[PDB]
Design a protein around this ligand. Structure first.
Ligand SMILES: CCC[C@H](NC(=O)c1cccc(Cn2ccnc2)c1)C(=O)N1CCc2sccc2C1
Length: 304
Protein backbone atom coordinates (compact mmCIF):
# COMPACT_ATOMS: atom_id res chain seq x y z
CA UNK A 1 0.00 0.00 0.00
CA UNK A 2 1.36 3.47 -1.04
CA UNK A 3 -0.08 6.94 -0.22
CA UNK A 4 -1.56 9.29 -2.92
CA UNK A 5 -0.67 12.79 -1.55
CA UNK A 6 -1.88 15.44 -4.06
CA UNK A 7 -1.35 19.26 -3.82
CA UNK A 8 -4.51 21.00 -2.44
CA UNK A 9 -3.27 24.49 -1.38
CA UNK A 10 -0.23 26.79 -1.84
CA UNK A 11 0.13 29.40 1.00
CA UNK A 12 2.06 32.59 0.01
CA UNK A 13 2.76 35.55 2.34
CA UNK A 14 6.28 35.18 3.86
CA UNK A 15 8.76 37.59 2.12
CA UNK A 16 11.93 35.54 3.03
CA UNK A 17 12.74 31.79 3.50
CA UNK A 18 10.20 29.79 5.51
CA UNK A 19 12.05 28.08 8.38
CA UNK A 20 9.43 25.78 10.05
CA UNK A 21 5.77 24.71 9.77
CA UNK A 22 3.81 22.92 12.55
CA UNK A 23 0.14 21.82 12.90
CA UNK A 24 -1.72 22.71 16.14
CA UNK A 25 -2.48 19.61 18.29
CA UNK A 26 -6.25 20.36 17.85
CA UNK A 27 -5.76 20.07 14.00
CA UNK A 28 -7.28 23.53 13.25
CA UNK A 29 -4.15 25.57 12.41
CA UNK A 30 -0.71 25.55 10.76
CA UNK A 31 1.95 27.87 12.24
CA UNK A 32 4.87 29.03 10.01
CA UNK A 33 8.11 30.83 11.01
CA UNK A 34 10.33 32.73 8.55
CA UNK A 35 13.62 34.63 8.08
CA UNK A 36 11.24 37.65 7.58
CA UNK A 37 10.92 37.77 11.48
CA UNK A 38 7.20 36.72 11.28
CA UNK A 39 4.96 33.88 12.46
CA UNK A 40 1.89 33.32 10.24
CA UNK A 41 -1.19 31.24 11.17
CA UNK A 42 -3.15 29.41 8.40
CA UNK A 43 -6.28 27.20 8.35
CA UNK A 44 -5.01 23.56 8.32
CA UNK A 45 -7.87 22.30 6.05
CA UNK A 46 -8.54 25.32 3.71
CA UNK A 47 -5.02 26.98 3.78
CA UNK A 48 -6.82 30.31 4.53
CA UNK A 49 -4.38 32.95 5.89
CA UNK A 50 -5.49 33.65 9.53
CA UNK A 51 -3.06 36.18 11.17
CA UNK A 52 0.56 37.43 11.50
CA UNK A 53 2.38 37.46 14.89
CA UNK A 54 5.46 39.76 15.09
CA UNK A 55 7.95 41.13 17.68
CA UNK A 56 11.25 39.27 17.09
CA UNK A 57 14.08 41.69 16.09
CA UNK A 58 15.67 39.10 13.68
CA UNK A 59 14.69 35.99 11.62
CA UNK A 60 12.82 33.06 13.29
CA UNK A 61 14.26 29.51 12.86
CA UNK A 62 11.55 27.40 14.57
CA UNK A 63 8.05 27.48 16.19
CA UNK A 64 6.17 24.98 18.40
CA UNK A 65 2.62 24.64 19.82
CA UNK A 66 1.49 24.04 23.43
CA UNK A 67 -0.70 20.95 23.98
CA UNK A 68 -3.90 23.10 24.41
CA UNK A 69 -3.16 24.76 20.98
CA UNK A 70 -3.27 28.17 22.78
CA UNK A 71 0.46 29.09 22.92
CA UNK A 72 3.35 29.15 20.45
CA UNK A 73 7.05 29.35 21.31
CA UNK A 74 9.47 30.79 18.69
CA UNK A 75 13.31 30.56 18.45
CA UNK A 76 15.02 33.62 16.83
CA UNK A 77 18.47 34.82 15.60
CA UNK A 78 17.85 37.69 18.16
CA UNK A 79 19.10 35.09 20.79
CA UNK A 80 15.63 34.92 22.45
CA UNK A 81 12.60 32.66 22.45
CA UNK A 82 9.13 34.23 22.72
CA UNK A 83 5.97 32.61 24.18
CA UNK A 84 2.86 33.89 22.30
CA UNK A 85 -0.87 33.82 23.10
CA UNK A 86 -2.11 32.83 19.61
CA UNK A 87 -5.69 34.23 20.02
CA UNK A 88 -4.55 37.73 21.26
CA UNK A 89 -1.15 37.90 19.46
CA UNK A 90 0.32 38.87 22.90
CA UNK A 91 4.02 38.14 23.58
CA UNK A 92 3.58 36.62 27.11
CA UNK A 93 7.31 35.97 27.79
CA UNK A 94 10.75 36.70 26.26
CA UNK A 95 13.17 33.87 27.23
CA UNK A 96 16.68 35.42 27.57
CA UNK A 97 19.92 33.46 28.24
CA UNK A 98 21.32 32.01 24.97
CA UNK A 99 24.52 33.82 23.83
CA UNK A 100 23.94 33.10 20.07
CA UNK A 101 21.10 32.33 17.56
CA UNK A 102 18.29 30.18 19.02
CA UNK A 103 17.78 27.48 16.36
CA UNK A 104 15.19 24.93 17.65
CA UNK A 105 12.46 24.74 20.32
CA UNK A 106 9.68 22.47 21.64
CA UNK A 107 7.15 22.25 24.47
CA UNK A 108 6.97 19.09 26.60
CA UNK A 109 3.63 17.19 26.29
CA UNK A 110 2.53 18.64 29.74
CA UNK A 111 3.36 22.10 28.19
CA UNK A 112 4.89 23.43 31.45
CA UNK A 113 8.47 23.32 29.99
CA UNK A 114 10.21 24.58 26.81
CA UNK A 115 13.47 23.07 25.50
CA UNK A 116 15.73 25.16 23.20
CA UNK A 117 18.93 24.55 21.26
CA UNK A 118 21.33 27.28 20.13
CA UNK A 119 24.42 28.07 18.03
CA UNK A 120 25.94 28.66 21.56
CA UNK A 121 26.17 24.77 21.66
CA UNK A 122 23.86 24.63 24.76
CA UNK A 123 20.38 23.19 25.35
CA UNK A 124 18.19 25.19 27.83
CA UNK A 125 15.06 24.02 29.73
CA UNK A 126 12.66 26.91 30.56
CA UNK A 127 9.63 27.29 32.88
CA UNK A 128 6.61 28.27 30.68
CA UNK A 129 4.78 30.08 33.56
CA UNK A 130 7.74 32.29 34.76
CA UNK A 131 9.90 32.40 31.57
CA UNK A 132 12.91 31.54 33.83
CA UNK A 133 15.74 29.27 32.58
CA UNK A 134 15.70 26.18 34.90
CA UNK A 135 18.74 24.29 33.42
CA UNK A 136 21.60 25.01 30.97
CA UNK A 137 22.96 21.69 29.53
CA UNK A 138 26.55 21.73 28.13
CA UNK A 139 25.08 19.53 25.41
CA UNK A 140 27.41 19.78 22.35
CA UNK A 141 30.69 21.21 20.93
CA UNK A 142 29.00 22.77 17.83
CA UNK A 143 25.58 24.27 16.96
CA UNK A 144 22.52 22.32 18.20
CA UNK A 145 20.27 21.33 15.23
CA UNK A 146 17.22 19.86 17.09
CA UNK A 147 15.62 19.33 20.57
CA UNK A 148 12.54 17.15 21.25
CA UNK A 149 10.74 15.73 24.32
CA UNK A 150 9.59 12.07 24.40
CA UNK A 151 5.87 11.23 24.80
CA UNK A 152 5.81 11.65 28.67
CA UNK A 153 8.37 14.54 28.85
CA UNK A 154 10.89 12.44 30.90
CA UNK A 155 13.60 12.61 28.17
CA UNK A 156 15.03 15.21 25.75
CA UNK A 157 16.89 14.19 22.55
CA UNK A 158 19.38 16.75 21.09
CA UNK A 159 21.46 16.67 17.87
CA UNK A 160 24.45 18.70 16.69
CA UNK A 161 26.90 19.54 13.87
CA UNK A 162 29.37 17.76 16.30
CA UNK A 163 27.86 14.47 14.89
CA UNK A 164 26.27 13.37 18.23
CA UNK A 165 22.71 12.56 19.29
CA UNK A 166 22.29 12.83 23.09
CA UNK A 167 19.44 11.75 25.40
CA UNK A 168 18.92 13.87 28.58
CA UNK A 169 16.96 13.25 31.79
CA UNK A 170 14.54 16.27 31.94
CA UNK A 171 14.39 16.19 35.80
CA UNK A 172 18.18 15.88 36.54
CA UNK A 173 19.80 17.40 33.41
CA UNK A 174 22.04 14.27 33.26
CA UNK A 175 23.25 13.04 29.83
CA UNK A 176 21.88 9.43 29.82
CA UNK A 177 23.10 8.36 26.33
CA UNK A 178 25.32 9.48 23.44
CA UNK A 179 24.54 7.72 20.08
CA UNK A 180 27.63 7.01 17.89
CA UNK A 181 27.50 5.04 14.58
CA UNK A 182 30.49 3.69 12.51
CA UNK A 183 31.10 7.41 11.62
CA UNK A 184 29.88 10.83 12.96
CA UNK A 185 28.68 13.06 10.06
CA UNK A 186 26.85 16.27 11.23
CA UNK A 187 23.39 15.41 12.69
CA UNK A 188 20.95 17.86 11.07
CA UNK A 189 17.71 16.65 12.78
CA UNK A 190 16.47 14.29 15.52
CA UNK A 191 13.09 13.44 17.09
CA UNK A 192 11.49 10.64 19.16
CA UNK A 193 8.95 8.25 17.56
CA UNK A 194 5.38 8.79 18.84
CA UNK A 195 5.73 5.71 21.18
CA UNK A 196 9.09 7.11 22.52
CA UNK A 197 10.95 3.81 21.81
CA UNK A 198 12.86 5.09 18.72
CA UNK A 199 14.75 8.16 17.50
CA UNK A 200 14.73 9.34 13.87
CA UNK A 201 18.10 11.04 13.07
CA UNK A 202 19.11 12.88 9.88
CA UNK A 203 22.80 13.18 8.89
CA UNK A 204 24.40 15.40 6.17
CA UNK A 205 25.39 12.22 4.21
CA UNK A 206 21.87 12.07 2.58
CA UNK A 207 20.70 9.53 5.24
CA UNK A 208 17.87 9.18 7.82
CA UNK A 209 18.22 6.43 10.48
CA UNK A 210 15.71 4.95 12.95
CA UNK A 211 17.60 4.14 16.22
CA UNK A 212 16.53 1.92 19.14
CA UNK A 213 18.14 4.25 21.78
CA UNK A 214 17.43 1.69 24.62
CA UNK A 215 19.51 -0.92 22.63
CA UNK A 216 21.63 1.86 20.97
CA UNK A 217 21.20 -0.02 17.59
CA UNK A 218 20.20 1.31 14.09
CA UNK A 219 16.93 -0.46 12.97
CA UNK A 220 16.18 1.25 9.57
CA UNK A 221 18.09 3.40 7.01
CA UNK A 222 16.24 5.71 4.50
CA UNK A 223 18.02 7.20 1.41
CA UNK A 224 17.30 8.53 -2.13
CA UNK A 225 16.82 12.19 -1.00
CA UNK A 226 19.43 15.01 -1.00
CA UNK A 227 20.59 16.33 2.42
CA UNK A 228 24.24 17.59 2.63
CA UNK A 229 23.76 21.24 3.78
CA UNK A 230 20.50 22.02 5.65
CA UNK A 231 18.75 21.02 8.90
CA UNK A 232 15.56 19.56 7.33
CA UNK A 233 12.63 18.46 9.55
CA UNK A 234 11.47 14.82 9.20
CA UNK A 235 8.27 13.22 10.53
CA UNK A 236 6.51 9.95 11.42
CA UNK A 237 3.17 9.90 9.49
CA UNK A 238 0.71 7.80 11.59
CA UNK A 239 -2.88 8.84 10.51
CA UNK A 240 -2.97 6.20 7.67
CA UNK A 241 0.02 4.13 6.46
CA UNK A 242 3.16 4.22 8.69
CA UNK A 243 5.55 6.53 6.76
CA UNK A 244 8.71 8.59 7.23
CA UNK A 245 8.30 12.08 5.64
CA UNK A 246 11.18 14.48 4.91
CA UNK A 247 12.13 17.55 2.88
CA UNK A 248 15.07 17.44 0.44
CA UNK A 249 17.62 19.78 -1.21
CA UNK A 250 16.33 18.52 -4.64
CA UNK A 251 13.06 20.50 -3.92
CA UNK A 252 10.90 17.35 -3.29
CA UNK A 253 9.00 15.91 -0.31
CA UNK A 254 10.10 12.24 0.19
CA UNK A 255 7.76 9.62 1.76
CA UNK A 256 9.21 6.19 2.76
CA UNK A 257 7.51 3.00 4.02
CA UNK A 258 8.83 2.91 7.66
CA UNK A 259 9.22 -0.93 7.77
CA UNK A 260 10.39 -1.70 4.16
CA UNK A 261 12.46 1.59 3.70
CA UNK A 262 11.18 1.89 0.05
CA UNK A 263 10.30 5.39 -1.31
CA UNK A 264 6.50 5.34 -1.84
CA UNK A 265 6.06 8.98 -3.03
CA UNK A 266 8.06 12.08 -4.08
CA UNK A 267 5.87 15.24 -4.03
CA UNK A 268 6.80 17.71 -6.84
CA UNK A 269 5.95 21.46 -6.84
CA UNK A 270 8.43 23.44 -4.66
CA UNK A 271 11.15 25.46 -6.52
CA UNK A 272 13.73 25.58 -3.64
CA UNK A 273 14.99 23.33 -0.80
CA UNK A 274 12.07 21.77 1.14
CA UNK A 275 13.35 22.74 4.63
CA UNK A 276 10.29 21.71 6.67
CA UNK A 277 7.49 19.09 6.57
CA UNK A 278 4.73 18.49 9.17
CA UNK A 279 2.03 15.77 9.46
CA UNK A 280 -1.57 16.66 10.52
CA UNK A 281 -2.56 15.03 13.86
CA UNK A 282 -5.80 13.30 12.55
CA UNK A 283 -6.12 13.72 8.69
CA UNK A 284 -3.69 12.38 6.00
CA UNK A 285 -2.37 15.94 5.39
CA UNK A 286 1.28 17.06 4.96
CA UNK A 287 2.49 20.68 5.12
CA UNK A 288 5.82 21.49 3.37
CA UNK A 289 7.77 24.77 3.19
CA UNK A 290 10.73 25.98 1.11
CA UNK A 291 13.67 28.40 1.27
CA UNK A 292 14.06 31.88 -0.13
CA UNK A 293 13.87 31.25 -3.94
CA UNK A 294 10.32 29.73 -3.36
CA UNK A 295 8.92 31.03 0.02
CA UNK A 296 5.66 29.01 -0.29
CA UNK A 297 3.98 26.50 2.06
CA UNK A 298 2.06 23.61 0.36
CA UNK A 299 -0.78 21.47 1.84
CA UNK A 300 -0.98 17.88 0.39
CA UNK A 301 -3.81 15.35 1.11
CA UNK A 302 -3.89 11.51 0.68
CA UNK A 303 -6.83 9.00 0.85
CA UNK A 304 -4.50 6.70 2.96
C1 LIG B 1 23.36 25.99 5.20
C2 LIG B 1 23.31 27.23 6.02
C3 LIG B 1 23.32 26.98 7.53
C4 LIG B 1 22.34 25.92 8.03
N1 LIG B 1 20.98 26.41 7.97
C5 LIG B 1 19.97 25.56 8.17
O1 LIG B 1 20.17 24.37 8.36
C6 LIG B 1 18.58 26.12 8.16
C7 LIG B 1 18.22 27.33 7.56
C8 LIG B 1 16.91 27.77 7.60
C9 LIG B 1 15.94 26.99 8.22
C10 LIG B 1 16.27 25.76 8.78
C11 LIG B 1 15.21 24.84 9.32
N2 LIG B 1 15.40 24.49 10.74
C12 LIG B 1 15.62 23.23 11.25
C13 LIG B 1 15.70 23.39 12.59
N3 LIG B 1 15.53 24.71 12.93
C14 LIG B 1 15.36 25.33 11.79
C15 LIG B 1 17.60 25.35 8.77
C16 LIG B 1 22.64 25.65 9.51
O2 LIG B 1 22.11 26.36 10.36
N4 LIG B 1 23.51 24.66 9.83
C17 LIG B 1 24.33 23.89 8.87
C18 LIG B 1 23.96 22.42 8.88
C19 LIG B 1 23.90 21.95 10.30
S1 LIG B 1 23.95 20.26 10.79
C20 LIG B 1 23.89 20.69 12.43
C21 LIG B 1 23.85 22.04 12.61
C22 LIG B 1 23.84 22.76 11.38
C23 LIG B 1 23.74 24.26 11.23
Amino acid sequence: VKPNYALKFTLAGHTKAVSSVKFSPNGEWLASSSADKLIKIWGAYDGKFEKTISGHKLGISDVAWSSDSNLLVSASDDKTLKIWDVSSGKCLKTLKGHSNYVFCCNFNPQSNLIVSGSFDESVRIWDVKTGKCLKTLPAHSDPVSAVHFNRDGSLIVSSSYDGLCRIWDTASGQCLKTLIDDDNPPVSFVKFSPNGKYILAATLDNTLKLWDYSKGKCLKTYTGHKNEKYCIFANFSVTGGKWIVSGSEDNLVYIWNLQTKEIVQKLQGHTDVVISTACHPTENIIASAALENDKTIKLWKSDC
